[PDB]
Design a protein around this nucleic acid. Sequence first.
DNA 1: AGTACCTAGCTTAAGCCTCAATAA
RNA 2: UAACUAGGGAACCCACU
DNA 3: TTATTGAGGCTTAAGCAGTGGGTTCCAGGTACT
Lengths: 96, 630, 67
Amino acid sequence: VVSGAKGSKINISQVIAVVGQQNVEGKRIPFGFKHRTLPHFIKDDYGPESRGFVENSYLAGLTPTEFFFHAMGGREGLIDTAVKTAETGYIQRRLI
Amino acid sequence: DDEITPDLWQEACWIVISSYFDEKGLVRQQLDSFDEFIQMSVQRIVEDAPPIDLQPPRYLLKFEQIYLSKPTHWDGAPSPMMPNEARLRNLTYSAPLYVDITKTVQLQTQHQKTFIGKIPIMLRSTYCLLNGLTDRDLCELNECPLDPGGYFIINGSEKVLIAQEKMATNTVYVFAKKDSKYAYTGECRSCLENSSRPTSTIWVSMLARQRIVATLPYIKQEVPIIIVFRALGFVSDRDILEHIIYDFEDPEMMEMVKPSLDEAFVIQEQNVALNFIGSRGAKPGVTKEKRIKYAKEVLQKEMLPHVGVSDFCETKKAYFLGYMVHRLLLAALGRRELDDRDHYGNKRLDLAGPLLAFLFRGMFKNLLKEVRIYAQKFIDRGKDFNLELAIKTRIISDGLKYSLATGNWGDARAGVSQVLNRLTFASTLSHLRRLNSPIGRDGKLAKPRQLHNTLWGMVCPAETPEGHAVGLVKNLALMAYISVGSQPSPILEFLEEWSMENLEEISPAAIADATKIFVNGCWVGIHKDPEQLMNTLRKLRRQMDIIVSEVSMIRDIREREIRIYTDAGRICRPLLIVEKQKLLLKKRHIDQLKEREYNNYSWQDLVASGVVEYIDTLEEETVMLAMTPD
Amino acid sequence: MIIPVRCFTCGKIVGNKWEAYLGLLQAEYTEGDALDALGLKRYCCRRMLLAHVDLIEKLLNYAPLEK
DNA sequence: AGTACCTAGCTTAAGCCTCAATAA
RNA sequence: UAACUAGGGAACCCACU
DNA sequence: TTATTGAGGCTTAAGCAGTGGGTTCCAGGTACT
Ligand SMILES: [Zn+2]
């Protein structure tokens, strides 16, 4: 990290201390079920672990709810990458 | 004392999972769907086709019984064809389809077991030649015992039907259209199952400004809902509003139904409403009675076929239309949340069975059409015609083979059938457990590509392509099962036996306090004690009674509804049953499952004990679920 | 499909030890004790036997095309 | 028989419709 | 008494950066 | 008073990053001898 070759301080913090809050479209994990993020929670649960705060590190290991919410965040990243390339190509061609 | 202690829990749960995979395997969805198709859907399509008639001497032909042989190859004597021989010789692994036709003119004759076409057989299904063979017998046929089957051999090429994901039928959904002329729109893709006409979608929308309007099938221009209600035979306002609003002590719904009644002030007679809704049809009527008869036919057939397609069912159809308007009003009032399109309880998976049944419906309609053509050509000369000459097995065999080979579905959509990936065994299993969303891949809408919450335990959250099909091509989770479909009839006789009053036998004043009951999306009546009814339905499902294990029974509690789902395409997974903070699974079940090959205790015995049950996505809404017994 | 003649990492002969490993396993040895009895001390040689899958016995279930 | 041959969603420019000053 | 080339299209699917 | 010529609201094309590999398909239908 301090050579600048690879990684960041955020990566070290995620590996060692805590992964953090998983987000979908800038908000926390939505109530995809009826007022629940998952059927393992009570209804109208607005706490950290219910709405996508991964309290474990990557070394400690994600709990299954945290695993699913992290999968949601990674899926959002992959979607953004694909639509980003597909949209920027046409802008490049029009500009040239 | 019989509880699994936490130090034994890992061993116990993995014995349960091992029993599940020993009983089931990994391709039950393909094999079960194709087996259901061959066993029931082919006969249902053949019998459901109308008795063809030509006229003068007038005769008619009827198809009564479907016979399927084992996969066979022929010029010479017919011989059984092993799938490896079909792989090597670039043949199609198919079985002959035989029907018996009656010809009544009157003189009645029996053309027993005439050949009408060849149906490709999915490997390791109940009608494949490898069904029930041992590992040694599979190796004698140069077949891999570890091969799961679940695919077709078409011209020597292994073809896998990718499961197609679609919006669930017969269910009312209310969405919001952004910056459209309609603020809130209702929607019901109505389809009478086991007949499966091209499905009819009705929209009950409300204009933005607040009049409620109905978009009808085979009518071009939008139709006010009160005109539709008066066209059903309810020329009043107490009748229509009793069908729509079940509670007269709520005046806000009365305010929101003010403008529809005000705009429908012109028409107060039934036949005037029929003329109004028939003047705007796809085929305009020449005269008034033609318009009235056309609109009557539209209301009887095209409008809500799943609640009823025959005559004398206008009261049930009016109740369901009023339910649609009531859902629209509750959405506008805000008392009901807007429906989620990406919720997997609102979606069905078209497996090999339903897709081949759609193909078989189209091709049997075609085969009947050239039977009409041949009989009409040979009846103009007054001569009798041979049925063997009239039957064209070419079109059905080659159409089914062509759609399984190229993947183009219908005589529409492509990529339904794909060449099975045989690079590694994991790729073979993954391709056999693949789910496809038919949303166009050039769209930038992230919502169908996003990993929704309701994919827990049903669809893998990690396995997806990273290209243009990200989030659209999905993969089935390991113990996730897709419901194969069943008849809703025994649940209906049990319900009418269990103090549930039908819709046609109640006053509309009793709707407000009771719980509406929907069976496969059809409102069948109301029940005044929903909690003991749901307990009884659960007890029947846990005991492997007349309710089969794949039937979904959902009780919405905040708004009084009980929905029972029996149709195919529902994705479900087994869950242990917890009662009074204790697992119903005890140490004796694990002990019996340990000697699984000795006492013949299996996964089915674990289901039949009321220990595990299959919960789909809609029922998972109402489930309070523990991750671990800890 | 069949046991490699040598360990990939170091080159110790392991092709003569698969049948002896199977004989020790059916003699109610643990896998670690069976590896220790065959003289496989380095873990590079140990996972040649520990992780091996004998596909050749499944291949022999099919009759040869000529005989 | 072999075969001749005769026939899902977006944004935006462009084209097309009804209502108001104004002279006849 | 070395006689010297390649071939179409339309759709779909998959993979890759 | 009244046509008359000017300016605000409706449909419909035209677009929509690249590189390989594989698969299927590009025609039956009666006459007639
Ligand atoms: Zn070594």
